[PDB]
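Quick one before lunch.
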Amino acid sequence: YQLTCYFTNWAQYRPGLGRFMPDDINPCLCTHLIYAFAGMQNNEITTIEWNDVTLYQAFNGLKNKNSQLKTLLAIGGWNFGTAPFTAMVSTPENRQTFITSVIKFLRQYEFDGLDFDWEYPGSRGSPPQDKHLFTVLVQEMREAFEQEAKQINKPRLMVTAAVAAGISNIQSGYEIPQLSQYLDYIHVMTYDLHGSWEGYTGENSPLYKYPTDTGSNAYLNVDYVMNYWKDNGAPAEKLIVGFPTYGHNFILSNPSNTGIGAPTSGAGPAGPYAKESGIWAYYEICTFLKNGATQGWDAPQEVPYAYQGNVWVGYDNVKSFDIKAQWLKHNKFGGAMVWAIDLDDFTGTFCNQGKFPLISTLKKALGLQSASC
Ligand SMILES: Nc1nnc(N2CCN(CCOc3ccc(Br)cc3)CC2)[nH]1
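Model of the 3RM complex:
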């Protein structure tokens, strides 16, 4: 199995114990590390933070401590939106401009490949033609990488992509069989499956359906989503299951109603480190737990939840990560990816379960513990 871990270049700005830099990464923890994010200017890949070049050096420098480690640069992400991708794929000139810049950029800064985080072709403003044009872009990139490898006589750069978990988004976004052919790995974003937008409590990344989930709600679980990708053309071995080291929180409409599907009246409070409306990093959740929040277990879906006063959080812990890792093995998927390494309890001080307790759980469960360094 692979264990692919996203690092975020804005984690550096979190106060005190929240600050996470590339040198905070244990080089022996994951098999692949992904740097989020690069941007785009005039159809060319660019840095986004002032210190990205220095951070690229530290990040890829981790490969000096673990010879097996591969690194990829992620372009795009949620806030990036679709507009620069749409314009870039709109013409073969723009795609070649982009592809050329990517080869040069990855080789210069010592990345082993590119992760596409276009969220998403065919939605969030992206027109219907982008579904096919994404396939075309990925084909042309994979073919350019193959070409370059011949020119410079080295193994080719990798191409991977983060892909939607929502069924409508998948249908409007991807030519699964054709696309799957050209990608090295498919990082399926099996999280944010529920949230306060829905008006009821729900889990972030439930493994299975809750009994009351019917109709389109029956699709909002890891198992359904991973099998949808496989059934519609992605080889199990290229499929990588998304694991979140965070949870969504909610304001309960009634503090006495705390089960799955209890009414909610909005997004729960930002945490004191990540400062994210309606979302707590795992280490932030550990504070909540440590200070007396009531813990629940959602047995049907194999995930924890917790509540206190009017606040309810659906999340993942060591138990739920282990359960999902065993499931992944039973289904023989390619491995796991983690959003994000900087949201795990990297200091060990919040949850008191050792450093990187969630990601270490996956490393152990996936038989990677004896991996080389
Ligand atoms: N592979 C990949 N590419 N893009 C993603 N996702 C990550 C999650 N994201 C919504 C929640 O994002 C936050 C935000 C803040 C905090 Br704290 C925790 C999570 C959407 C984009 N995954």
